Design a protein around this ligand. Structure first.
Ligand SMILES: O=c1ccn([C@@H]2O[C@H](COP(=O)(O)OP(=O)(O)O[C@H]3O[C@H](CO)[C@H](O)[C@H](O)[C@H]3O)[C@@H](O)[C@H]2O)c(=O)[nH]1
Ligand SMILES: O=c1ccn([C@@H]2O[C@H](COP(=O)(O)OP(=O)(O)O[C@H]3O[C@H](CO)[C@H](O)[C@H](O)[C@H]3O)[C@@H](O)[C@H]2O)c(=O)[nH]1
Ligand SMILES: CCCCCCCCO[C@@H]1O[C@H](CO)[C@H](O)C[C@H]1O[C@@H]1O[C@@H](C)[C@@H](O)[C@@H](O)[C@@H]1O
Ligand SMILES: CCCCCCCCO[C@@H]1O[C@H](CO)[C@H](O)C[C@H]1O[C@@H]1O[C@@H](C)[C@@H](O)[C@@H](O)[C@@H]1O
Ligand SMILES: [Mn+2]
Ligand SMILES: [Mn+2]
Lengths: 277, 277
């Protein structure tokens, strides 16, 4: 049950004035594509706070990648879901190397020890009972990253992927999907909506567990058949999101590499960006 | 559980090419606004057929309005949810005046007798147990109308309203919301997203029952206080959808009066239109 919104004063949306005329803001299956200018964050914050929403953020920091945790977490504190309930889940082979980072109120961090050495992340996420009890949504991101700007409840939805920053302008034949019919991740050259990056996906706990289960099972079949998809779990993520359309798509504002790709006119904000390695 | 979509060949959506540049296609709370060119109906039909979706359509034909049923139903057969399961619910004081209309396969019609003589429609819809058992979505429309073009699963969502054809270009101060603070339907001049028409709303059975219950209760409070909102149940519908944002908004393609308003450039299709009375 969703209670009433309070009175709010904000600019009237105008039917004959698009927010953005330079980009596609809705997919052909009527999922929003999230760009700056498409959302009133005050309205969304109200809606999600009225549901007392809890967001889980999973991040893997295995072997040398523990060095990325300090900047990742400190910048997450500045920019990720501020004002909402957040539970970070840090999967690592080195629990003692996790930096002591000061958290804002309503935010917690759990260290989950794992084995070191593409199958690990999808298998590890598909924690099943814990996430169902503790959070409403799961967001699954790369650690070799930093938040530079707002990443908030505008992303939340049953299932989302993120446009790969290298391929948002590419035609589908150029996408680096797995192209061998012998792989479970196979997508032919005449199929595909978008190329999603493995570094930022999420959704409700239920939908994220479905996706990660399916990708894990598909990767196991491939392993048994002696094939490894060209881009590993990303290849399977793309296969999954082709056959199970996401209910929102994040623009490349949400996954950018400024060193590689600069700052194009189409990006009004760079929100979550690659750290040099 | 949603099974996989089959392989499909369709045009690739392009991130740097908007479908429509002339209209707002997503609200500031990230609900799609449904216009022609925003959706691939083949994808949506697949998604909704894979869930074996059943759509209930409610229509009231009381007193002289029974005369509108023949054209309403015959044109619904040509254009409304064709290929999907449909259950029409015709509420009338004259069961014997309901025309015998031939239905396509998978479609059924129930005649529900009611009393003759704004409270009736919201009260009557909030049938509660029957709809929950028989349909997935409810669509609630005026009878003095005809379908001229496709109205399909693109509209389905937990909660939707439709932009009133007279007001989609209007600023909010000009909207004919109820303006007296003594009414439950009161909306001040600095609030409001859109002006929704009472003639086409819907959603999941649960959300439609919530809306109709709330509007019925609000109208009862008004009656007890000796006030009747300026546009009756439409005034309350607008209050409800202000405080409970719809998850899709239908463009005026879905509710048009060609005699009054012609055929503006912004409408690529006229789907569901007023019959002269
Ligand atoms: O030694 C490692 C390697 C990786 N990671 C974790 O795995 C994440 C992903 O690894 P990278 O950042 O090195 O790789 P990309 O994000 O470039 O991932 C893409 O390239 C990969 C192969 O390099 C796979 O194909 C993957 O599916 C695809 O999304 C890292 O952020 C980190 O969280 C570790 O913790 N330790
Ligand atoms: O004698 C009647 C009158 C109305 N109706 C039913 O009620 C529907 C709505 O009535 P109208 O078509 O006459 O009115 P509008 O659609 O123009 O409705 C708008 O104007 C109404 C007052 O005229 C209310 O304010 C209502 O909330 C607002 O949406 C009709 O389609 C019909 O289904 C009947 O069956 N018999
Ligand atoms: C010559 C150097 C490597 C830089 C060129 C990489 C450009 C394409 O990005 C890569 O795309 C792959 C799928 O085709 C896969 O997702 C890995 C991805 O590379 C990662 O993401 C990029 C945006 C960069 O941050 C890159 O460094 C990172 O490895
Ligand atoms: C002088 C004649 C009446 C025609 C002028 C009506 C224009 C405005 O439409 C009316 O708007 C009201 C809210 O302000 C309320 O929704 C009723 C609505 O009138 C109905 O819908 C219109 C689009 C027409 O189909 C109209 O005939 C119908 O009554
Ligand atoms: Mn990375
Ligand atoms: Mn009418």
């Amino acid at each position: 049950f969703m209670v009433s919104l309070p009175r709010m004063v904000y600019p009237q949306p105008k039917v004959l004035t698009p927010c953005r005329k330079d980009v596609l803001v809705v997919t052909p299956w009527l999922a929003p594509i999230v760009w700056e200018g498409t959302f009133n964050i005050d309205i969304l914050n109200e809606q999600f706070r009225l549901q007392n929403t809890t967001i889980g953020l999973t991040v893997f920091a295995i072997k040398k990648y523990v060095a990325f945790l300090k900047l990742f977490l400190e910048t997450a504190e500045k920019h990720f879901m501020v004002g909402h309930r957040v539970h970070y889940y840090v999967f690592t082979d080195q629990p003692a190397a996790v930096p002591r980072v000061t958290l804002g109120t309503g935010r917690q961090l759990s260290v989950l020890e794992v084995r070191a050495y593409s199958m690990r992340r999808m298998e590890m996420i598909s924690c099943e009972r814990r996430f169902l009890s503790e959070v409403d949504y799961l967001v699954c991101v790369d650690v070799d990253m930093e938040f530079r700007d707002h990443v908030g409840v505008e992303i939340l939805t049953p299932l989302f992927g993120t446009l790969h920053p290298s391929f948002y302008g590419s035609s589908r034949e150029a996408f680096t999907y797995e192209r061998r019919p012998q792989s479970q991740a196979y997508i032919p050259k005449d199929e595909g909506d978008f190329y999603y990056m493995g570094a930022f996906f999420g959704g409700s706990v239920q939908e994220v567990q479905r996706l990660t289960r399916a990708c894990h099972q598909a990767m196991m079949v491939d392993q048994a058949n002696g094939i490894e998809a060209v881009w590993h779990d990303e290849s399977h993520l793309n296969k999954y999101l082709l056959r199970h359309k996401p209910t929102k798509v994040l623009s490349p504002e949400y996954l950018w590499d400024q060193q590689l790709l600069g700052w194009p006119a189409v990006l009004r904000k760079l929100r979550f960006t690659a750290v040099p390695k």
